[PDB]
């Protein structure tokens, strides 16, 4: 063991945690993403996600931050379903609600009245094909042509909701049948398949069924292919490495602890993420969120994506990609992956 590398992991993690705690707003929310002159800035979703990411840390002051985040979420009690959403003005959605429930578990509130109500509301989003849909049609229409894209089963949201032990068995078959022939999964709202693939493989691993182990191993083999020798996942947008996709690939690669090639790939990914950290403790934003047209069931077959902030003159969100302009969503993802990977150095 190279103690300098463990010490740098500590230093890197601590600098990121300080960045994230300082980055909260007046009331204490983590905010990220922006739909300018429309839906504004995310808060409930971003806070649920970031709080869940930081739940791996064994620091009392981080646990206090998570307790405060849950108290903020409980005050967002304005929706009749008990759901959370992107921010106050959005309708509830299953993804945000699932992350808020993961956070509730970390702070001992899984059995709370609100968590029970929110879990019940998640059940409303279960589809006939065995997955979970992000939105109920009339909800997202009331906030805003077919909405069957936005209101269909989503593999990214199903993978994340399957982190909840109450839903893991009900979503299992849908998660198994959606694996591609290459071993990965593809998401709906995200460009980077590492997100859906890591979350799905982690849900299968947590269910403990031996029947699922071949699928997990195929996903790990896909992750090993995705990570180049220099320690990153290359994308079209970031051909010299995506911090977001690399952090999710690192989490995927923790699902095999015996293979020497997998171990070496993790070590390479850790080194590259350590080198990429900015002086303020953050990593470069790379959490690319896509807005398919409402009718589009198949965004991985939409070749037209443009980056919203790069479009000149007239623009719309449909068919565009946004990112986490504060770097909070990316940084939380990276620091979580480094905390989870460090003991398997």
Short mmCIF file of N, CA, C and O in Angstrom, two decimals, residues 121-249:
data_model
loop_
_atom_site.label_atom_id
_atom_site.label_comp_id
_atom_site.label_asym_id
_atom_site.label_seq_id
_atom_site.Cartn_x
_atom_site.Cartn_y
_atom_site.Cartn_z
N UNK A 121 -46.40 6.95 -2.81
CA UNK A 121 -46.51 7.72 -4.04
C UNK A 121 -45.63 7.08 -5.11
O UNK A 121 -46.04 7.07 -6.29
N UNK A 122 -44.46 6.60 -4.77
CA UNK A 122 -43.60 5.93 -5.77
C UNK A 122 -44.32 4.76 -6.40
O UNK A 122 -44.14 4.55 -7.62
N UNK A 123 -45.14 4.06 -5.65
CA UNK A 123 -45.81 2.87 -6.17
C UNK A 123 -46.72 3.28 -7.33
O UNK A 123 -46.90 2.47 -8.27
N UNK A 124 -47.23 4.50 -7.33
CA UNK A 124 -48.13 5.00 -8.39
C UNK A 124 -47.42 5.06 -9.76
O UNK A 124 -48.11 5.02 -10.77
N UNK A 125 -46.09 5.17 -9.76
CA UNK A 125 -45.27 5.30 -10.96
C UNK A 125 -44.84 3.95 -11.54
O UNK A 125 -44.22 3.97 -12.63
N UNK A 126 -45.15 2.84 -10.88
CA UNK A 126 -44.83 1.53 -11.43
C UNK A 126 -45.66 1.27 -12.68
O UNK A 126 -46.86 1.49 -12.65
N UNK A 127 -45.00 0.75 -13.72
CA UNK A 127 -45.63 0.52 -15.04
C UNK A 127 -45.94 -0.95 -15.24
O UNK A 127 -45.26 -1.82 -14.70
N UNK A 128 -46.91 -1.26 -16.13
CA UNK A 128 -47.17 -2.64 -16.58
C UNK A 128 -45.95 -3.46 -17.03
O UNK A 128 -45.92 -4.64 -16.74
N UNK A 129 -44.88 -2.83 -17.55
CA UNK A 129 -43.66 -3.58 -18.00
C UNK A 129 -42.64 -3.80 -16.88
O UNK A 129 -41.58 -4.45 -17.14
N UNK A 130 -43.00 -3.42 -15.69
CA UNK A 130 -42.27 -3.75 -14.45
C UNK A 130 -41.26 -2.73 -13.96
O UNK A 130 -40.61 -3.06 -12.88
N UNK A 131 -41.06 -1.65 -14.71
CA UNK A 131 -40.22 -0.48 -14.37
C UNK A 131 -40.99 0.70 -13.75
O UNK A 131 -42.21 0.62 -13.54
N UNK A 132 -40.26 1.75 -13.45
CA UNK A 132 -40.88 2.94 -12.88
C UNK A 132 -40.72 4.12 -13.83
O UNK A 132 -39.64 4.31 -14.44
N UNK A 133 -41.80 4.88 -13.95
CA UNK A 133 -41.84 6.11 -14.78
C UNK A 133 -41.47 7.33 -13.91
O UNK A 133 -41.87 7.42 -12.76
N UNK A 134 -40.82 8.31 -14.50
CA UNK A 134 -40.42 9.54 -13.79
C UNK A 134 -41.66 10.34 -13.42
O UNK A 134 -41.80 10.78 -12.25
N UNK A 135 -42.53 10.60 -14.37
CA UNK A 135 -43.66 11.53 -14.20
C UNK A 135 -44.98 10.85 -14.50
O UNK A 135 -45.07 9.98 -15.38
N UNK A 136 -46.02 11.29 -13.83
CA UNK A 136 -47.42 11.07 -14.21
C UNK A 136 -47.80 12.14 -15.24
O UNK A 136 -47.49 13.35 -15.02
N UNK A 137 -48.48 11.70 -16.28
CA UNK A 137 -48.73 12.55 -17.45
C UNK A 137 -49.43 13.86 -17.06
O UNK A 137 -49.03 14.93 -17.57
N UNK A 138 -50.50 13.78 -16.28
CA UNK A 138 -51.34 14.98 -16.05
C UNK A 138 -50.52 15.94 -15.19
O UNK A 138 -50.59 17.16 -15.44
N UNK A 139 -49.64 15.43 -14.32
CA UNK A 139 -48.81 16.27 -13.44
C UNK A 139 -47.87 17.14 -14.27
O UNK A 139 -47.76 18.36 -14.00
N UNK A 140 -47.14 16.52 -15.18
CA UNK A 140 -46.09 17.23 -15.96
C UNK A 140 -46.76 18.06 -17.06
O UNK A 140 -46.28 19.15 -17.34
N UNK A 141 -47.86 17.60 -17.63
CA UNK A 141 -48.66 18.48 -18.51
C UNK A 141 -49.14 19.75 -17.78
O UNK A 141 -49.16 20.83 -18.44
N UNK A 142 -49.63 19.63 -16.53
CA UNK A 142 -50.21 20.79 -15.78
C UNK A 142 -49.09 21.80 -15.56
O UNK A 142 -49.32 22.96 -15.62
N UNK A 143 -47.88 21.32 -15.31
CA UNK A 143 -46.71 22.20 -15.11
C UNK A 143 -46.35 22.91 -16.42
O UNK A 143 -46.07 24.14 -16.34
N UNK A 144 -46.28 22.18 -17.55
CA UNK A 144 -45.89 22.67 -18.92
C UNK A 144 -47.01 23.56 -19.53
O UNK A 144 -47.90 23.97 -18.75
N UNK A 145 -49.40 16.74 -28.48
CA UNK A 145 -48.11 15.99 -28.56
C UNK A 145 -48.07 14.88 -27.46
O UNK A 145 -48.57 15.04 -26.31
N UNK A 146 -47.51 13.71 -27.76
CA UNK A 146 -47.40 12.55 -26.83
C UNK A 146 -46.48 12.96 -25.68
O UNK A 146 -45.43 13.54 -25.95
N UNK A 147 -46.85 12.60 -24.46
CA UNK A 147 -45.89 12.59 -23.31
C UNK A 147 -45.44 11.18 -22.93
O UNK A 147 -44.87 10.96 -21.84
N UNK A 148 -45.60 10.20 -23.81
CA UNK A 148 -45.30 8.78 -23.48
C UNK A 148 -43.80 8.56 -23.31
O UNK A 148 -43.42 7.53 -22.71
N UNK A 149 -42.94 9.44 -23.83
CA UNK A 149 -41.50 9.40 -23.52
C UNK A 149 -41.24 9.76 -22.07
O UNK A 149 -40.66 8.93 -21.33
N UNK A 150 -41.70 10.93 -21.65
CA UNK A 150 -41.44 11.38 -20.27
C UNK A 150 -42.21 10.56 -19.23
O UNK A 150 -41.81 10.61 -18.05
N UNK A 151 -43.25 9.84 -19.61
CA UNK A 151 -44.18 9.16 -18.68
C UNK A 151 -44.10 7.64 -18.84
O UNK A 151 -44.94 6.94 -18.26
N UNK A 152 -43.11 7.15 -19.55
CA UNK A 152 -42.85 5.71 -19.63
C UNK A 152 -41.87 5.26 -18.57
O UNK A 152 -41.17 6.07 -17.96
N UNK A 153 -41.72 3.95 -18.47
CA UNK A 153 -40.69 3.37 -17.61
C UNK A 153 -39.32 3.86 -18.05
O UNK A 153 -39.01 3.80 -19.26
N UNK A 154 -38.48 4.22 -17.10
CA UNK A 154 -37.12 4.76 -17.34
C UNK A 154 -36.10 3.87 -16.63
O UNK A 154 -36.24 3.63 -15.43
N UNK A 155 -35.08 3.41 -17.32
CA UNK A 155 -34.15 2.47 -16.69
C UNK A 155 -33.27 3.16 -15.64
O UNK A 155 -32.96 2.54 -14.61
N UNK A 156 -32.88 4.39 -15.88
CA UNK A 156 -32.06 5.18 -14.96
C UNK A 156 -32.83 5.37 -13.62
O UNK A 156 -32.28 5.16 -12.54
N UNK A 157 -34.10 5.75 -13.70
CA UNK A 157 -34.93 5.98 -12.51
C UNK A 157 -35.22 4.64 -11.86
O UNK A 157 -35.15 4.53 -10.60
N UNK A 158 -35.50 3.59 -12.60
CA UNK A 158 -35.76 2.26 -12.05
C UNK A 158 -34.52 1.76 -11.29
O UNK A 158 -34.65 1.21 -10.18
N UNK A 159 -33.33 1.96 -11.82
CA UNK A 159 -32.08 1.53 -11.19
C UNK A 159 -31.94 2.24 -9.84
O UNK A 159 -31.55 1.63 -8.83
N UNK A 160 -32.15 3.53 -9.82
CA UNK A 160 -31.99 4.32 -8.60
C UNK A 160 -33.06 3.92 -7.57
O UNK A 160 -32.73 3.77 -6.38
N UNK A 161 -34.30 3.75 -7.95
CA UNK A 161 -35.39 3.38 -7.03
C UNK A 161 -35.10 1.98 -6.49
O UNK A 161 -35.43 1.71 -5.32
N UNK A 162 -34.50 1.13 -7.27
CA UNK A 162 -34.15 -0.24 -6.80
C UNK A 162 -33.06 -0.20 -5.72
O UNK A 162 -32.82 -1.27 -5.14
N UNK A 163 -32.42 0.92 -5.46
CA UNK A 163 -31.53 1.09 -4.27
C UNK A 163 -32.36 0.97 -2.97
O UNK A 163 -31.78 0.70 -1.93
N UNK A 164 -33.67 1.17 -3.04
CA UNK A 164 -34.57 1.08 -1.88
C UNK A 164 -34.95 -0.37 -1.72
O UNK A 164 -35.52 -0.98 -2.63
N UNK A 165 -34.71 -0.99 -0.55
CA UNK A 165 -34.99 -2.42 -0.41
C UNK A 165 -36.47 -2.74 -0.61
O UNK A 165 -36.80 -3.82 -1.00
N UNK A 166 -37.35 -1.77 -0.38
CA UNK A 166 -38.81 -1.98 -0.51
C UNK A 166 -39.20 -2.20 -1.99
O UNK A 166 -40.24 -2.83 -2.23
N UNK A 167 -38.40 -1.68 -2.93
CA UNK A 167 -38.72 -1.72 -4.39
C UNK A 167 -37.80 -2.68 -5.14
O UNK A 167 -38.10 -2.98 -6.28
N UNK A 168 -36.73 -3.14 -4.55
CA UNK A 168 -35.66 -3.84 -5.27
C UNK A 168 -36.25 -5.10 -5.92
O UNK A 168 -36.05 -5.35 -7.16
N UNK A 169 -36.97 -5.93 -5.20
CA UNK A 169 -37.57 -7.17 -5.75
C UNK A 169 -38.60 -6.88 -6.85
O UNK A 169 -38.60 -7.59 -7.86
N UNK A 170 -39.43 -5.87 -6.69
CA UNK A 170 -40.49 -5.55 -7.65
C UNK A 170 -39.84 -5.09 -8.98
O UNK A 170 -40.42 -5.40 -10.04
N UNK A 171 -38.71 -4.39 -8.96
CA UNK A 171 -38.05 -3.86 -10.18
C UNK A 171 -37.07 -4.87 -10.80
O UNK A 171 -36.55 -4.63 -11.88
N UNK A 172 -36.77 -5.98 -10.13
CA UNK A 172 -35.70 -6.91 -10.54
C UNK A 172 -35.85 -7.38 -12.01
O UNK A 172 -34.87 -7.37 -12.74
N UNK A 173 -36.99 -7.91 -12.37
CA UNK A 173 -37.15 -8.55 -13.69
C UNK A 173 -36.95 -7.48 -14.76
O UNK A 173 -36.33 -7.76 -15.79
N UNK A 174 -37.53 -6.29 -14.57
CA UNK A 174 -37.37 -5.18 -15.54
C UNK A 174 -35.89 -4.85 -15.69
O UNK A 174 -35.36 -4.71 -16.82
N UNK A 175 -35.17 -4.75 -14.58
CA UNK A 175 -33.72 -4.47 -14.66
C UNK A 175 -33.00 -5.63 -15.39
O UNK A 175 -32.10 -5.36 -16.22
N UNK A 176 -33.35 -6.86 -15.14
CA UNK A 176 -32.64 -7.94 -15.85
C UNK A 176 -32.92 -7.89 -17.37
O UNK A 176 -31.97 -8.05 -18.18
N UNK A 177 -34.15 -7.68 -17.78
CA UNK A 177 -34.48 -7.80 -19.23
C UNK A 177 -33.96 -6.62 -20.01
O UNK A 177 -33.79 -6.74 -21.24
N UNK A 178 -33.64 -5.51 -19.36
CA UNK A 178 -33.15 -4.29 -20.05
C UNK A 178 -31.64 -4.25 -20.24
O UNK A 178 -31.13 -3.35 -20.93
N UNK A 179 -30.89 -5.20 -19.73
CA UNK A 179 -29.43 -5.20 -19.92
C UNK A 179 -29.19 -5.40 -21.43
O UNK A 179 -29.78 -6.28 -22.05
N UNK A 180 -28.22 -4.69 -21.96
CA UNK A 180 -27.87 -4.84 -23.39
C UNK A 180 -27.00 -6.06 -23.60
O UNK A 180 -26.40 -6.57 -22.64
N UNK A 181 -26.78 -6.41 -24.87
CA UNK A 181 -25.93 -7.57 -25.18
C UNK A 181 -24.47 -7.29 -24.80
O UNK A 181 -23.72 -8.27 -24.64
N UNK A 182 -24.06 -6.01 -24.64
CA UNK A 182 -22.68 -5.65 -24.28
C UNK A 182 -22.48 -5.65 -22.74
O UNK A 182 -21.32 -5.48 -22.29
N UNK A 183 -23.54 -5.83 -21.97
CA UNK A 183 -23.42 -5.88 -20.50
C UNK A 183 -23.81 -4.63 -19.77
O UNK A 183 -23.93 -4.65 -18.53
N UNK A 184 -24.01 -3.54 -20.48
CA UNK A 184 -24.42 -2.28 -19.86
C UNK A 184 -25.93 -2.10 -19.88
O UNK A 184 -26.66 -2.84 -20.50
N UNK A 185 -26.36 -1.03 -19.23
CA UNK A 185 -27.71 -0.49 -19.36
C UNK A 185 -27.58 0.92 -19.94
O UNK A 185 -26.50 1.52 -19.87
N UNK A 186 -28.68 1.36 -20.50
CA UNK A 186 -28.83 2.72 -21.03
C UNK A 186 -29.94 3.43 -20.26
O UNK A 186 -30.99 2.83 -20.03
N UNK A 187 -29.69 4.67 -19.92
CA UNK A 187 -30.66 5.50 -19.22
C UNK A 187 -31.52 6.35 -20.14
O UNK A 187 -31.32 6.39 -21.36
N UNK A 188 -32.46 7.05 -19.57
CA UNK A 188 -33.37 7.94 -20.27
C UNK A 188 -32.84 9.37 -20.21
O UNK A 188 -32.53 9.98 -21.29
N UNK A 189 -32.65 9.90 -19.00
CA UNK A 189 -32.31 11.33 -18.83
C UNK A 189 -30.82 11.63 -18.91
O UNK A 189 -30.43 12.78 -18.88
N UNK A 190 -29.97 10.64 -18.92
CA UNK A 190 -28.52 10.83 -18.85
C UNK A 190 -27.83 10.38 -20.10
O UNK A 190 -28.14 9.31 -20.64
N UNK A 191 -26.82 11.13 -20.48
CA UNK A 191 -25.96 10.77 -21.62
C UNK A 191 -25.07 9.59 -21.25
O UNK A 191 -24.73 8.77 -22.12
N UNK A 192 -24.60 9.56 -20.00
CA UNK A 192 -23.50 8.64 -19.63
C UNK A 192 -24.09 7.34 -19.09
O UNK A 192 -24.62 7.30 -17.92
N UNK A 193 -23.96 6.23 -19.82
CA UNK A 193 -24.54 4.93 -19.46
C UNK A 193 -23.91 4.37 -18.18
O UNK A 193 -24.52 3.47 -17.59
N UNK A 194 -22.76 4.86 -17.77
CA UNK A 194 -22.11 4.40 -16.51
C UNK A 194 -23.03 4.63 -15.31
O UNK A 194 -22.98 3.84 -14.40
N UNK A 195 -23.78 5.72 -15.31
CA UNK A 195 -24.72 6.01 -14.22
C UNK A 195 -25.73 4.89 -14.07
O UNK A 195 -25.85 4.27 -12.97
N UNK A 196 -26.45 4.54 -15.11
CA UNK A 196 -27.51 3.53 -15.04
C UNK A 196 -26.87 2.18 -14.81
O UNK A 196 -27.45 1.34 -14.09
N UNK A 197 -25.75 1.90 -15.46
CA UNK A 197 -25.12 0.58 -15.37
C UNK A 197 -24.66 0.35 -13.92
O UNK A 197 -24.89 -0.74 -13.36
N UNK A 198 -23.97 1.31 -13.33
CA UNK A 198 -23.48 1.14 -11.93
C UNK A 198 -24.68 0.96 -11.01
O UNK A 198 -24.67 0.06 -10.16
N UNK A 199 -25.70 1.82 -11.11
CA UNK A 199 -26.83 1.73 -10.18
C UNK A 199 -27.54 0.39 -10.34
O UNK A 199 -27.99 -0.20 -9.36
N UNK A 200 -27.72 -0.08 -11.56
CA UNK A 200 -28.43 -1.35 -11.79
C UNK A 200 -27.62 -2.51 -11.21
O UNK A 200 -28.19 -3.37 -10.49
N UNK A 201 -26.33 -2.56 -11.54
CA UNK A 201 -25.49 -3.65 -11.03
C UNK A 201 -25.46 -3.62 -9.49
O UNK A 201 -25.45 -4.70 -8.85
N UNK A 202 -25.42 -2.42 -8.91
CA UNK A 202 -25.42 -2.32 -7.43
C UNK A 202 -26.74 -2.86 -6.88
O UNK A 202 -26.73 -3.56 -5.82
N UNK A 203 -27.89 -2.62 -7.51
CA UNK A 203 -29.19 -3.12 -6.99
C UNK A 203 -29.19 -4.63 -7.10
O UNK A 203 -29.66 -5.34 -6.18
N UNK A 204 -28.72 -5.18 -8.21
CA UNK A 204 -28.64 -6.64 -8.35
C UNK A 204 -27.71 -7.22 -7.28
O UNK A 204 -28.02 -8.28 -6.70
N UNK A 205 -26.57 -6.60 -7.05
CA UNK A 205 -25.63 -7.08 -6.04
C UNK A 205 -26.28 -7.04 -4.64
O UNK A 205 -26.14 -7.99 -3.88
N UNK A 206 -27.02 -5.99 -4.32
CA UNK A 206 -27.59 -5.84 -2.98
C UNK A 206 -28.70 -6.88 -2.77
O UNK A 206 -28.96 -7.27 -1.63
N UNK A 207 -29.35 -7.37 -3.83
CA UNK A 207 -30.41 -8.37 -3.66
C UNK A 207 -29.85 -9.76 -3.35
O UNK A 207 -30.62 -10.59 -2.84
N UNK A 208 -28.58 -10.01 -3.63
CA UNK A 208 -27.90 -11.23 -3.15
C UNK A 208 -28.26 -12.48 -3.94
O UNK A 208 -27.83 -13.59 -3.54
N UNK A 209 -29.01 -12.38 -5.04
CA UNK A 209 -29.44 -13.62 -5.74
C UNK A 209 -28.30 -14.09 -6.63
O UNK A 209 -27.78 -13.29 -7.45
N UNK A 210 -27.88 -15.33 -6.47
CA UNK A 210 -26.79 -15.86 -7.34
C UNK A 210 -27.14 -15.80 -8.83
O UNK A 210 -26.20 -15.68 -9.67
N UNK A 211 -28.42 -15.91 -9.15
CA UNK A 211 -28.87 -15.87 -10.56
C UNK A 211 -28.44 -14.56 -11.21
O UNK A 211 -28.39 -14.51 -12.44
N UNK A 212 -28.22 -13.51 -10.44
CA UNK A 212 -27.89 -12.17 -10.97
C UNK A 212 -26.39 -11.96 -11.11
O UNK A 212 -25.97 -11.00 -11.75
N UNK A 213 -25.55 -12.84 -10.58
CA UNK A 213 -24.10 -12.60 -10.55
C UNK A 213 -23.52 -12.58 -11.96
O UNK A 213 -22.66 -11.72 -12.22
N UNK A 214 -23.92 -13.46 -12.91
CA UNK A 214 -23.37 -13.35 -14.27
C UNK A 214 -23.61 -11.97 -14.90
O UNK A 214 -22.72 -11.42 -15.52
N UNK A 215 -24.80 -11.44 -14.68
CA UNK A 215 -25.17 -10.11 -15.21
C UNK A 215 -24.29 -9.04 -14.61
O UNK A 215 -23.84 -8.12 -15.33
N UNK A 216 -24.05 -9.12 -13.29
CA UNK A 216 -23.17 -8.16 -12.62
C UNK A 216 -21.77 -8.24 -13.22
O UNK A 216 -21.15 -7.21 -13.52
N UNK A 217 -21.27 -9.47 -13.39
CA UNK A 217 -19.89 -9.64 -13.90
C UNK A 217 -19.80 -9.09 -15.33
O UNK A 217 -18.77 -8.57 -15.71
N UNK A 218 -20.85 -9.30 -16.12
CA UNK A 218 -20.81 -8.76 -17.52
C UNK A 218 -20.76 -7.21 -17.47
O UNK A 218 -20.05 -6.60 -18.28
N UNK A 219 -21.50 -6.61 -16.56
CA UNK A 219 -21.47 -5.16 -16.40
C UNK A 219 -20.08 -4.69 -15.98
O UNK A 219 -19.56 -3.66 -16.45
N UNK A 220 -19.47 -5.40 -15.02
CA UNK A 220 -18.09 -5.06 -14.60
C UNK A 220 -17.12 -5.18 -15.79
O UNK A 220 -16.27 -4.31 -15.97
N UNK A 221 -17.24 -6.23 -16.59
CA UNK A 221 -16.38 -6.40 -17.78
C UNK A 221 -16.60 -5.21 -18.75
O UNK A 221 -15.61 -4.75 -19.33
N UNK A 222 -17.85 -4.79 -18.92
CA UNK A 222 -18.12 -3.60 -19.77
C UNK A 222 -17.40 -2.38 -19.17
O UNK A 222 -16.77 -1.60 -19.88
N UNK A 223 -17.49 -2.19 -17.85
CA UNK A 223 -16.83 -1.05 -17.18
C UNK A 223 -15.33 -1.08 -17.40
O UNK A 223 -14.70 -0.04 -17.59
N UNK A 224 -14.75 -2.27 -17.32
CA UNK A 224 -13.30 -2.42 -17.51
C UNK A 224 -12.93 -1.96 -18.95
O UNK A 224 -11.89 -1.30 -19.12
N UNK A 225 -13.77 -2.28 -19.95
CA UNK A 225 -13.56 -1.84 -21.36
C UNK A 225 -13.70 -0.31 -21.48
O UNK A 225 -12.98 0.32 -22.24
N UNK A 226 -14.65 0.26 -20.76
CA UNK A 226 -14.93 1.71 -20.79
C UNK A 226 -13.78 2.53 -20.22
O UNK A 226 -13.56 3.69 -20.65
N UNK A 227 -13.10 2.01 -19.23
CA UNK A 227 -11.99 2.74 -18.61
C UNK A 227 -10.74 2.54 -19.46
O UNK A 227 -10.32 1.43 -19.74
N UNK A 228 -10.17 3.60 -19.96
CA UNK A 228 -8.94 3.39 -20.73
C UNK A 228 -7.80 3.28 -19.73
O UNK A 228 -7.92 3.54 -18.52
N UNK A 229 -6.63 2.89 -20.26
CA UNK A 229 -5.45 2.68 -19.41
C UNK A 229 -5.00 3.92 -18.62
O UNK A 229 -4.44 3.77 -17.54
N UNK A 230 -5.32 5.12 -19.12
CA UNK A 230 -4.92 6.38 -18.47
C UNK A 230 -5.82 6.69 -17.26
O UNK A 230 -5.51 7.63 -16.53
N UNK A 231 -6.90 5.96 -17.07
CA UNK A 231 -7.69 6.02 -15.84
C UNK A 231 -8.98 6.76 -16.00
O UNK A 231 -9.56 7.14 -14.98
N UNK A 232 -9.47 6.94 -17.21
CA UNK A 232 -10.74 7.66 -17.39
C UNK A 232 -11.64 6.97 -18.41
O UNK A 232 -11.18 6.20 -19.29
N UNK A 233 -12.91 7.33 -18.34
CA UNK A 233 -13.93 7.03 -19.35
C UNK A 233 -13.95 8.19 -20.31
O UNK A 233 -14.29 9.33 -19.94
N UNK A 234 -13.62 7.89 -21.56
CA UNK A 234 -13.66 8.84 -22.69
C UNK A 234 -15.07 8.91 -23.24
O UNK A 234 -15.71 7.88 -23.46
N UNK A 235 -15.53 10.12 -23.53
CA UNK A 235 -16.83 10.39 -24.17
C UNK A 235 -16.59 11.24 -25.43
O UNK A 235 -15.57 11.88 -25.57
N UNK A 236 -17.62 11.32 -26.26
CA UNK A 236 -17.59 12.24 -27.42
C UNK A 236 -17.33 13.66 -26.93
O UNK A 236 -16.54 14.43 -27.55
N UNK A 237 -18.00 14.06 -25.87
CA UNK A 237 -17.87 15.46 -25.38
C UNK A 237 -16.53 15.68 -24.66
O UNK A 237 -15.95 16.76 -24.73
N UNK A 238 -16.08 14.66 -23.95
CA UNK A 238 -14.80 14.72 -23.18
C UNK A 238 -13.93 13.57 -23.61
O UNK A 238 -13.82 12.55 -22.92
N UNK A 239 -13.27 13.68 -24.78
CA UNK A 239 -12.49 12.57 -25.28
C UNK A 239 -11.25 12.26 -24.43
O UNK A 239 -10.69 11.21 -24.58
N UNK A 240 -10.87 13.18 -23.53
CA UNK A 240 -9.73 12.96 -22.59
C UNK A 240 -10.31 12.74 -21.18
O UNK A 240 -9.54 12.82 -20.22
N UNK A 241 -11.58 12.41 -21.05
CA UNK A 241 -12.14 11.87 -19.80
C UNK A 241 -13.24 12.75 -19.19
O UNK A 241 -13.06 13.96 -18.98
N UNK A 242 -14.35 12.10 -18.86
CA UNK A 242 -15.49 12.68 -18.14
C UNK A 242 -15.35 12.37 -16.63
O UNK A 242 -15.30 11.17 -16.27
N UNK A 243 -15.30 13.37 -15.78
CA UNK A 243 -15.23 13.14 -14.34
C UNK A 243 -16.46 12.40 -13.85
O UNK A 243 -16.32 11.45 -13.04
N UNK A 244 -17.64 12.74 -14.32
CA UNK A 244 -18.90 12.09 -13.91
C UNK A 244 -18.94 10.65 -14.34
O UNK A 244 -19.28 9.75 -13.53
N UNK A 245 -18.66 10.37 -15.60
CA UNK A 245 -18.76 9.00 -16.12
C UNK A 245 -17.67 8.17 -15.43
O UNK A 245 -17.89 6.98 -15.20
N UNK A 246 -16.49 8.72 -15.21
CA UNK A 246 -15.38 7.98 -14.58
C UNK A 246 -15.74 7.61 -13.13
O UNK A 246 -15.48 6.48 -12.71
N UNK A 247 -16.37 8.52 -12.40
CA UNK A 247 -16.75 8.25 -10.99
C UNK A 247 -17.80 7.14 -10.97
O UNK A 247 -17.70 6.21 -10.13
N UNK A 248 -18.77 7.17 -11.88
CA UNK A 248 -19.76 6.09 -11.90
C UNK A 248 -19.09 4.78 -12.32
O UNK A 248 -19.48 3.72 -11.79
N UNK A 249 -18.17 4.82 -13.28
CA UNK A 249 -17.48 3.58 -13.67
C UNK A 249 -16.69 3.02 -12.48
O UNK A 249 -16.63 1.79 -12.31
#
